[PDB]
Amino acid sequence: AMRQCAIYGKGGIGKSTTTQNLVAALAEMGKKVMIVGCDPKADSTRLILHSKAQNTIMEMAAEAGTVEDLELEDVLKAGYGGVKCVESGGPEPGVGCAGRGVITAINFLEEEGAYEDDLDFVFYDVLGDVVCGGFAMPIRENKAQEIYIVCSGEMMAMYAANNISKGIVKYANSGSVRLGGLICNSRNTDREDELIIALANKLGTQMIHFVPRDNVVQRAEIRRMTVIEYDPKAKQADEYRALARKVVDNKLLVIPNPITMDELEELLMEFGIMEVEDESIVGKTAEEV
Amino acid sequence: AMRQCAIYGKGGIGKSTTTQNLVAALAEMGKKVMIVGCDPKADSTRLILHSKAQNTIMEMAAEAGTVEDLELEDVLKAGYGGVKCVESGGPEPGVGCAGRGVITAINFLEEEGAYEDDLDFVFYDVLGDVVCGGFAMPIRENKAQEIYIVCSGEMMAMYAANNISKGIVKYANSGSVRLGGLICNSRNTDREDELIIALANKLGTQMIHFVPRDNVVQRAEIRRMTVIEYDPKAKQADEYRALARKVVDNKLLVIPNPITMDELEELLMEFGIMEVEDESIVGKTAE
């Protein structure tokens, strides 16, 4: 009776790190979990396998005679906590569509019976920036019912969360796909905490957890590992464990309430991220006072 | 002889700011220019029009029903120095496609005769992060002949520069889309200068210009303007005029030579952005 989840968020903010650590803690708790990477951009499996780069289904295709001639074992690779891993692979530059590749990979995993196995969770790690139909395919195709949005207290991360929420709504008139909460990947930015709680509230959801910035996360990283594995006796490990427990016992699943741009900027100015715009100087050259 | 150009690069490194400043410098030089924004998360015309957000072709049709029931005048606006600005409009979250969106905007403007107007340049401001078929459409359709890639001395941005080069490589045999050079948006990083000149070399192109970081940029920005208009006497203005001069006279247009991820990491390490990997302590606990 597995739960299909998706962690969405923009890049450049440690989404993959928080995802893998989250997945590590779950395994530690006694859960069988499978990670399906769906981000063209940042290795969402290296920390579970100590790998520099896991071979993707897409490259194992644009070379190994296309899909039907692939062996599950060459794609799926278990790691720490026996957590199974899989990397979809992004689109062939200039030609492919990220959405299509991701679906082809999921299909493969279903057909080759990868889900018919005793698995508690499955986390799809999707790039959640420009939420085009491509990247929303995991939602349109009912391949993940619970979505958690990794964001931080900065403009683009939040614009991204709003866009990801609009994608979810678009398919709310048809399915179990729901928003389960926001995960704030701290940037040690003032009031980031409150900013995300306020955002969650407006969206109709919750901030499932605040992941602090801890220099241990990076040490466990350049050694290609999660914190939970490096130093289980680390304060940070408890941080993810707290997140792992809350996702397990989470019952809030809603159809988000995207906000407007003005509404979003209001939020930013309200909690001290972006300043109020001085309308008097707009368009004034230096010569003009 | 109108030149069809495009500036490609990832988000978060000042691409649109450099694009608008560069276009500003061209207008100051007498060039009649038009900007067509094709970036979902970055206003590419706001510094030229002094506005917070320009009505996009997409949302101005979702209104009036559909493109045919649309007036050029409502989509194309002119701002500083006569520069004409058009905003494509990103994809409807969860459903649209950048490839579809850009073609819709290009086709309309062509049908409305926005191009044959005496115009010396057209600049497509395109997000060049994941170079999926959708964001490469301006390439597949030969709408952007000379591409200039904005990048900076950092992994993701150089990686983006590489992926854009493959996109250009992929349609070599069909059109006239070429790589004109790289533009380095300085990030106050040591050697960034050299790093990007090295990358260009590997790619087979040129570092057309190094754009310094300078607070006058943010000060013009906050007033919704380009440095050229805000403070024509500032050194940065000359920095942009220099880039515009090299672009107007540029004749080094090529088909790029992508590199491997390994060839890319070797570059970061050499110029010291990335450190060497301690083989030995991999996955080895610590304790």
Ligand code: SF4
């Ligand atoms: S739907 Fe998205 S990922 Fe797919 S080709 Fe279009 S912009 Fe790219």
